[PDB]
Amino acid sequence: LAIVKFLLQNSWQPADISARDSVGNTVLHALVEVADNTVDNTKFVTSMYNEILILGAKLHPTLKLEEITNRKGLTPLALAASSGKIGVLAYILQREIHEPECRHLSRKFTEWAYGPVHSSLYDLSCIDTCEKNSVLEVIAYSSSETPNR
């Protein structure tokens, strides 16, 4: 983390937080690629992901990071789902962050609660992404020539 910060925050050359590697992957794409579905793996990727977004929104608020497609046309989410990186998939869809500038970043919000009670709201990009893919649609097909999918 500290070096992620120093890269993006330093006086000498701040890192371009949205750059793409040879495959089209950004840091969010690479993180999805580096997941291996173990509990401690999810945990570290999940919050480093979180961290990147918090830094994106702090430093460069205009940038819609999670919408950036890798060579194959995949958002980080859609990659996650194409490669059965489930814990992270669940993390990306689930997460809601409350902070100044928080709303643009957050996937979902809880509208109201009663002494008992709770409500959860979901965005939801996967359902509405007709044009290229729907989290469901990649999931939906689904050939599942793998147990994990």
Binding site: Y114, G115, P116, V117
Partner: protein
């Protein structure tokens, strides 16, 4: 002068100053903090109730001032006991909210300025989920206070 909007905004930010000139206003116009015009026409929410929703650290002294004003006109009892009228929160009083929020201090305060302890909060928000939901304890402050383990 004060309209409904003016006070509700004051309450939202726990401002006890913009309500300096409050008491003397409805002394001139002899208006009551409980008038039709000082409630949301579809829910029946009052400033005290707005104050109950606009808590910061389980605190608001717009409440203490608001009550104080209601006794000086003795709107006092019906003020502290006004209830929601929309199908959702129907029959909810400020005392219900204080408990829902687990706030002894505000329970204490409301009971001392004469909150009706038998007031039944009976709207759909206080019965089993449509799902709406939710959530039922039924109705009466004691019942609430127990069902929420308090």
């Amino acid at each position: 002068l004060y309209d409904r909007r003016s006070i509700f905004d004051a309450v939202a930010q726990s401002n006890c100053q913009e309500l300096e000139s409050l008491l003397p206003f409805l002394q001139r116009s002899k208006k009551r903090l409980t008038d039709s015009e000082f409630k949301d026409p579809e829910t029946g929410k009052t400033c005290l109730l707005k104050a109950m929703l606009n808590l910061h650290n389980g605190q608001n002294d717009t409440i203490a001032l608001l009550l104080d004003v209601a006794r000086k006109t003795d709107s006092l009892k019906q003020f502290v006991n006004a209830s929601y009228t929309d199908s959702y929160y129907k029959g909810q009083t400020a005392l219900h909210i204080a408990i829902e929020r687990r706030n002894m201090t505000l329970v204490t305060l409301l009971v001392e300025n004469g909150a009706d302890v038998q007031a039944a909060a009976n709207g759909d928000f206080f019965k089993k989920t449509k799902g709406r939901p939710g959530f039922y304890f039924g109705e009466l402050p004691l019942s609430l206070a127990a069902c929420t383990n308090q």
